[PDB]
Fold:
Amino acid sequence: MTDRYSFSLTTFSPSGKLGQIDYALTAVKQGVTSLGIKATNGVVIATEKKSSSPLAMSETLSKVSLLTPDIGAVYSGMGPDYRVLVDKSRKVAHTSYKRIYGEYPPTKLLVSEVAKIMQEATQSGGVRPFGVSLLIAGHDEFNGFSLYQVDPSGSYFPWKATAIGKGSVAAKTFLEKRWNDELELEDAIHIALLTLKESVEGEFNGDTIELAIIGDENPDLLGYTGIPTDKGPRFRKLTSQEINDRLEAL
Amino acid sequence: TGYDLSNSVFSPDGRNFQVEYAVKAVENGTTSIGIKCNDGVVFAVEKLITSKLLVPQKNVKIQVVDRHIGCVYSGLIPDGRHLVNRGREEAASFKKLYKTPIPIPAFADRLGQYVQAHTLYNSVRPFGVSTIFGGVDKNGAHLYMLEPSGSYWGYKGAATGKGRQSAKAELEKLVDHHPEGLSAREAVKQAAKIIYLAHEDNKEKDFELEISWCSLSETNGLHKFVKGDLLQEAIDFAQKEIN
Amino acid sequence: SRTTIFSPEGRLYQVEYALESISHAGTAIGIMASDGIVLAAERKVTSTLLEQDTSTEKLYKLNDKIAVAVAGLTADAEILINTARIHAQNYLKTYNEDIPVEILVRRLSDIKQGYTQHGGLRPFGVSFIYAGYDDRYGYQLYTSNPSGNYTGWKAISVGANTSAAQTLLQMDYKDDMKVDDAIELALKTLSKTTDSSALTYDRLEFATIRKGANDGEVYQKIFKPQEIKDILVKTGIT
Amino acid sequence: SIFSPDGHIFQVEYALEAVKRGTCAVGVKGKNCVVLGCERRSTLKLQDTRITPSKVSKIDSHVVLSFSGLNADSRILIEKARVEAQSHRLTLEDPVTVEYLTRYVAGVQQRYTQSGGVRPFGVSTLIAGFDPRDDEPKLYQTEPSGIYSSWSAQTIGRNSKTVREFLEKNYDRKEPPATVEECVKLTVRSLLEVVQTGAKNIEITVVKPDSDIVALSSEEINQYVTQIEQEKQE
Amino acid sequence: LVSLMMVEKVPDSTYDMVGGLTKQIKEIKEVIELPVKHPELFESLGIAQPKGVILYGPPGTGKTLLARAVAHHTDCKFIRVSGAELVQKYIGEGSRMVRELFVMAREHAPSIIFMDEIDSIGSTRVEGSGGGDSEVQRTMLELLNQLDGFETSKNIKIIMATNRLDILDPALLRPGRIDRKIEFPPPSVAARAEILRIHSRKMNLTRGINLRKVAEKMNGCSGADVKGVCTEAGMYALRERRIHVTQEDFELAVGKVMNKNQETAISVAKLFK
Amino acid sequence: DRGVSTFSPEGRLFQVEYSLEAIKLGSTAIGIATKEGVVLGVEKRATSPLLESDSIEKIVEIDRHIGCAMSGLTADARSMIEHARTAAVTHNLYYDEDINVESLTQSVCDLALRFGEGASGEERLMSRPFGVALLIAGHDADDGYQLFHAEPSGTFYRYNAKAIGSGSEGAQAELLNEWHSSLTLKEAELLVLKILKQVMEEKLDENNAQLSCITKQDGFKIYDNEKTAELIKELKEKEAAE
Amino acid sequence: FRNNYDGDTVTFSPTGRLFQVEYALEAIKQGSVTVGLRSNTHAVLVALKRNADELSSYQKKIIKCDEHMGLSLAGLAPDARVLSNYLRQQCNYSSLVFNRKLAVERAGHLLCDKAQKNTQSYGGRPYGVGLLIIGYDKSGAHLLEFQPSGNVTELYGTAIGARSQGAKTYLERTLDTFIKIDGNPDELIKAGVEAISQSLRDESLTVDNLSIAIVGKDTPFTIYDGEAVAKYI
Amino acid sequence: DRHITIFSPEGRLYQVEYAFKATNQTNINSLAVRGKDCTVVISQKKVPDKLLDPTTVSYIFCISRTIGMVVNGPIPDARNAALRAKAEAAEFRYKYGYDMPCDVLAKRMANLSQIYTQRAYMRPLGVILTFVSVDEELGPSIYKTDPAGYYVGYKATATGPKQQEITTNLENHFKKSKIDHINEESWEKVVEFAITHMIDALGTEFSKNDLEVGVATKDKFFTLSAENIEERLVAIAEQ
Ligand SMILES: Nc1ncnc2c1ncn2[C@@H]1O[C@H](COP(=O)(O)OP(=O)(O)OP(=O)(O)O)[C@@H](O)[C@H]1O
Structure:
C-alpha cells in the first residue's frame, strides 16, 4: 500500500510528437470498422460485431450503447476501454447538469464532459490513455442534429459523415461520393450497409452486426401516458429481423 | 534477464522469477515439520548452534498467535515473525466480533491474501518464508503450510529448509505403514526421530530441539510447548532410529 | 525528461521543443488600429463534408469585451478558457466593475510554470492571442506561450513562418491605419503564407471588435461564413 | 538535486549561468541617492513599450527591484514579496526595513531548492531603497543559492566581466558619487559598453527618501548621453 | 590511374540548353572565368583569387546538367571522380590518391575538378564509431589550405556539390576556404515556359500551341518534370501510330504527375490546431 | 551516480562522505579555548573592494552569551541557527534559566539526520542534507567553556580547539603543537592571526577577518574593524621584534 | 562482476540474498568493539572508545535506557541513537500503563519488529549497526545480541567488530568459569578487560579510552568512565 | 515498454499477453454448459503427491446460495478475486434488496480489471473465470472474463491449455442436434454428457477423485463429494 508512480507517463519529442498517444492510434485502426452518417430526417450509426468463436452470444456484447434517451455512441479499437467510459459519462450528465437544470443537455456539452476526463488520462500521472476514439449523435430543440467524433488526445471533431478502423480510408474514399444534402433517413441505410458490405470477409447477416438510429418521438417506448407534452426517446436500436427486411429488399 | 529485476513484472513464460528466487532463500534455512495426528497437530523444528555462547532454551522459534494455535517457520527469522504480529491482532479482531474463537480456514483466509498483497506492488519485498500452522476448532483437526506466493494446502504433514528430500520420501515411507490413525503422544516420538534423521545434510554442526503439540484430548485443545522428561524420553528413543 | 532540471549549460530539455512544436500548428494573427481590431486563423483542415460552417474552434470568447485566438492542443487549451472565464466573473462578484486584461494574464500565466516548476507534469502545449479594452489604457493586444512570459504588441502572428509572416506586417502597417484599411492585411498576410494558395472562405475563421454602439458601448462581433465570404471579394480575390 | 564528489551541485553549478545569458543591469550607492539602470531590445518593431513588463518593478511605496535572467520566475516573487510587504505593515504597524524581505526572499530561493521535484530559479535579482525614518542607502544582491550580499554596485548579464571590473577604474570609496548628474553618468557610463546602440535599448529609475521615485524618458537619456557622446571625442 | 581524368571525348551540352537559368552564370563564371582569364587584371588589385565555390539546391534542377555543359566552353580541363569511387576497403588507399589528386592538377593550372555528392563525407563524429573516410576529408582540406594549396589556389578554382546541405562538417568551411555559395532553386512558372520550347522540338507544322499554358498550371520543384511529361507525351503519339501531337494529348501527360502532384497522402491528426 | 539511503559494498556511504569535502571548498573558521575565554575567527573571502563587508556575516549571536560560526556553505546554515534560537529561547521559558550547551547541540545534530528516520516520529524533510558545518562556543555552569563541533553527518565532538575548511589539514598542525592548559585569552586573540596570516591569499587587512570573544562575566561580544588592527600591530610587535 | 542486484533493498539475489544487507553487516567490521557478558546475577558492558586526535574528547559507546537497562553499540551512532530514544517510550509506556515494569527480552522482540518495517519499503535504509542490551528483571539477568538483520539472541557473552576474535576466543576458553560468579563484580569485570587485550593493535589502554557500565540483581545502571577506572588498569 | 502497462511501440500490451499465458502453469482443463433448468461445471483435480487432504483442495467456490465460479490459474491470484466477489454481492443487495445477478457482477469485475490496466501501482491477475448462475429474469446463464475486461456469455464453453481438443468437439455436436442447450431436464442426467465428451473427444480417462463438480440449482449452489460423484459416474454402467 504505497504510491510512488505519480510522474507523468507522457513524453515530449524534439519536434512535438507526444509519444504514447501517437502509438495509441494504431489500435484504433487495428480494431473493427464503424461509421456514422446524418440527415435532416434522422441519424444513423453502425459497426460489425466480430464474434470470435461460434459459441459467444452477441446479445451480451454492446458494440452500441445508449447515453441518454436522445443519444447513442459507438467505437472501434478496444472494448474494456469503452465499457467503463459510458458509465463515467452517464454519471456525469446528472452530477453536473441533469439534476441541476432538469432537462437533459444538448449533445456537445456532454462531449465537453468526456474529453475533460480523456485529457486527464494523459496529463495526469500514473496512467495511460483509453485506446479508443468514439462517436456521438446529436439532438436538441435549440441547435438540431449533429455528429461529434472524439479521440484520446482530448480533441473532438464535428462532422457530417465519417468512419474509422481497419477499413476507414476506403470508406472516406467512398462516402464522399454517396453523401449529399437532399436526404431522408430511409435511404441512408442502403448506402450505410452497401458501404459496410465491401469492407468485410465474413458473414453479413442481421444477427451478426448491430446498429441503431435516431428516429423521432416514440411514446410507445416511454412506458406511461397521459401527458401529451413529453418528448419520448428519439434514440432507438433495431432488431434481428428489421435488419434483414432491408437486406432482402436490396 | 531484464524482466527479473522487480516485483510485478510477468515473464513471457508467465511468471515473476523474483519470488522463485525467494524459494532459494527459504531453501537456505533450518528444518521444520508439523504433523496431522489423529486428534490435533504437532510441531518440531531444527535449531542449530554456532558457539556454546548461545544459551539453550531462551531463544524459541515457534510463535503463538492465540490460545488454540501454534505456528513455526523457516528461513528469514524476522520476516516470518512480522505476519504473526499481524496474526496476533487479526483473530483478536475476530473474537471481538461473534465472541467465539477463530477457525483455521479463517486464519489463511485472513493471511494467505496478505502476503499476496506484498507481490502486487513495485515497492515491497515478498515474504521470503515458508510457514506452517495448525490447531483445532469446533470442527476438529486441521493443518496447513504456506509458500511465499500466497499458496497453501491442507496437508497431513509438511517440511521445509534443507530437510525436504529426507522427510518427504520418509513420510511416503511412513503413511502406508500407519494410515489407521496416529494419536498425539506417539507422533511426538516419531517426529523427533526425523529431525535427527534429517540433520545429515548439515551434520558438520550441532543444535538442540524444540517441540510443541496441541490435543483436543490432552490440553483441552490449547497450545502448550514441551518442557519435561517426555522430550528426554524421545531423544533417548530417536537416537535408536538412527542407531 | 525530468521537467524541473536545467541543461548542463543553462537551458531546458523539454520546453524548447514545445514552443518549437507549436510551430507545426495553424496560424493565428492579431492586430490593432486606433479604431478597431481584427483577427484571423486558418483551420488545419478544410475538407468539405464536415461542419466547417459552424466550426468555432480557433476563436473563442471570454466575456463581453474580450476575444482571443488559439494555437496548440485542442484540449489542453480547452480547459484554460473554462478556468480563466471564472477568474473573470469571479473578479466581478467582489468588485462589480469590468475586468482589465493587465491583471488577467499576469494573474493567469503564472499557472504555467507551476507545472514546469514541480509535480513532474508536462507544461501546456498552447499559445494565445489576446484582445480587448479597458477604460484606463485604451485598446489593447497581448500574447503568451507555454513559458508564461507575455508581451504587448501592435500586430503579431504565430505558427507557420510567423517569423516570416511578421515581416509582411513590417512595412505595410500604419499608425493611424484604420480598420477597413487594416483588415485586408490579415488575409493578405495569410494569402501569402498559405500552403494551399487555392483558398477557401471555409478554411479560415474570423472575429472582430469595435465600439460600434453609441453611448460608448462595444460589440464582440463574430462573423459568419457568407459574410466574410463576401468580404473576401472586397479586396478582390476572384 | 544532490552533492557531487567535488563539493558542488550539478543543477546549481548550472543555474547561475542562466542569468549570465540575459539582460544586464546595475545600480549604485550614491552620496545621498540610489539608482538603477537596465536594458531593452531596440529594433523590437511594431510594439508600444508603455505596457511591457519593465525589468524594474516596485514592491512598496519606498522600495523597488530589478531582476534579470528569466521573466516568469521573476513575476512570482514580486507577488509573494508584495504580500510580506503589505502584511508586515499590519501586524507590527511599522513598515519594512530593506534587509527583512531580503532576508525573506534569501530564504525562499532554497525552500525551492531542497525538496522533491522542484527546480531553482533562472533568476538573480537585486533591490534598493532607503529604510523608513532613516537616510543611509541600502542595496542588496541575490542569487538562487540564497546568499544575500551588499554590493555598492552589482551587475548580472551579458559581456558583464569587464563591466564587473569597469567600475573599479571609476568608483572610489572616499570619492563617492557627488550628485545625480554624475552618479547617473556613472549609471550609464557602465552600461553603455554593452548597449552598442542608442537610448531606446535601456530603461532606468532612481530613488530618494520618502518614496521619491522617478522614471526618465528616452529623451532625458538623449540629453546626457550626448554630453559624453560629445565627451567621447577628445 | 587516369580513368578519373578529363576527356578527349568531351560531352556535347551547352549553357544555352538551360532555359530559366539566366543570372547564375554571371554570378559564378567570373571566379572561374575572369581573373584566370586576366590575372594581371585581377592582380591590378589582386585581392584573392578565391578557392572553390559551392551550389546547394534540391533535385529536379540539373545542377549536374549544368556541370556537363560548363566542361564545354572552358579553356581548361574538367576532371571527374565519379563521386565516392576514391574510397576502397582499406586505409592506405585514401590519402595517397588525394596526394595523387592535387598533383594531377598542379601540372595543369587552367584546370579544375568536379564533385556531385558530399553527403558521404559529412559530419564526422567519433567515440569508437566512425570510419577511415573521416581521415581523408582532413588531408584534402589540409592540402587545400597549407604550404602547398595556395599555389594550387594560385593555379586553381574548384567546386563541390550535393543536394542536402546542413548535414556535413561545418569545420570544413573556413569561408575563404570556400568564398561563395549559391542556391539553385526550383523555377518560376514563366521560367518553366522556355523549357519545353527546348525539348519538344518535334511538332510538325502544327498549330493551336500554347507553351505558356503548362507553367500556367504547375506548382512543382523540378524542371526535369517538363521533360518527364514531355517525353511520355510523345509516347501516346508513339503508340497510336500518328507521329503528330497537340496540346491536350500533351496535357493529360500530367496525369502521370497526377500521382506525383497528389501522391503525398495526408494525416487526420487534429491533436493541435 | 549514487543516491541517499543506499550503502556500498565497502559500507562507506557516498553522498554524506561527499558532503564531508564541500566544507573543504569554503572559507576558514577557527575558535580556540582558553580557561578564561574563547575566541572565534574567519576569512571573509572578500572578492572585490566596493563591497561593504558589514553585510557578510559569518558570525552570529544566539543569545547574549552564546555564538557560533558557520563554514563551508554559508547559505544553508542560515536556516538552522533559527532552529537553535528557537530551542534556546524555548528552554529559557520552561525553566527560567539558560540552557546547557549539550542539551542544545544534540538537537541541531538531531536535525541534519532528518533525511530518513530522524528522531522518534520524524517525517522526512530535507531531500538532501546540509552541505555545511560549524562550531559552537559558550559557557554553561556544569562543565566549563566546552566548545562543540558539528558536521551534517549527525555527530558532535568536544574539542580543545581545531579548524575547518581550506586550511584544515595543514593549519591545525600548528594548533596541535601550540595549545596547552595555562595560556591566556588575548594570547588566543592573537595566536590565530599567526595562523590565518599563513593561509590567506593576500596580505591581511582589518576587513579580511574579524573576531569575537566569549566570557562568563559579560557574555558575548563581537569586536570592531579597528580593534583587530591594534593587536595585529601587537603581533607585529613580535613579528618585528622576533 | 557487477551485481545489478545491489541497488534498492527489496530485490532478492538469484540465490536468496539481499546484497544491501550483507554489504551493510561489514560496517561494524569497520566499526569498533564493545563486549559484554553475564553471570547468573550480574551482567556487563564494555567498550573501547575511538578518539579523533590528541586534542578531541572521545566518541561514546554506552547509553542508559532506564533504571534497569543500558546498552552499548558498534559502528554508527545516529541511526543507533534513535532506537535508544525510541524504546524509552516503550519503557515509560510500560511503567505508566501498567507499572509492571519492563521485561528485557520483549524489547528485542519489539526491536526486531522495527527494522523489518524498514527493509521492505522503498526508501529507507536499515538501522545498520550491531549493539548489545543488558538489564535485570524478575527472571534474573540477561544479555542480548543485535544485528541490523533483526536476529537477536540470548547469550552468555560475545563481542563485536574489528579485532574482536581475540576477545571472542577467551570466552569459549572460559565459559566454564565466569558463569558461576556472584556478588563480586570486580574480578568479573577484568575478565573481559584482560580478554580484550587480545585485540589491542598496540594502543595500550588508558584511564579514558575505556568505558564500563554494568547492572545486577541489585544495582541500577551505573557508568564508570572519566577517571574512576584506575581501579582496573 | 516490456515491463509496464504503457501502450507498445506498435500498440499491443506485452505485459498483458504474458498474463494469459501465466494461467497455463498447471495443465488443467475445465468445462461449462447450460442445462434445461440447471447448469454444470467441472475441471481436472490433479494430486501428484500422496500426503494431501483433497478434502481441502478446490477451485470451485461458493459465493451465494445462488451462484458459483471456477478458476484455471494460480489460486493465490484467485482468492483475491474470490474474496472481492463475496463483498460485491452484499453491497448490492444491501443497497437494493435482492440477490446479485451474474450479468451485472461480471460487468462490475470487468470494469475493475480495466483500472488495473490503466494504472501502474498494480499487478494484474493471471487468471480467468467462468461465472455460473440461474436468473429469475434470464434463466440459466454463464459469463467468462479475461484479465483485460472482455467478458461474454457462452451457451457452453471450456478452458485450459486444450481448448482446441474439445471446443471443436462441442461445435460438432450442436451441428448434430442444433439447439442452444440440452434437451434434458435433470442436472443429474446431463453431467454424463459432459464426462462422456471429455474422455472421448481428446481427453484422458478419469477416476473418482480426478474431477470436481458444481451445479447452480434453482435457489441452490453446491459442490459434490465422493460417492455423489462415483454414483453419477456409474451412469456409464449403461453406456
Ligand atoms: N533548366 C534545365 N536545363 C536543362 N536540364 C534541366 C533543367 N532543369 C532540369 N533539368 C533536368 O534535370 C535532370 C537532373 O537534375 P536533378 O537536379 O534532378 O538531378 P541531378 O542534378 O543530376 O542530381 P545530383 O545533383 O544529385 O547528381 C537532368 O536530366 C536535366 O535534363
About this structure: The longest strand of chain A covers residues 43-47. Chains A and D do not touch (no CB pair under 8 Å). The pocket of adenosine-5'-triphosphate is lined by residues E 17-21, 59-65, 116, 163, 195, 222-224, 227 (CB under 6 Å).
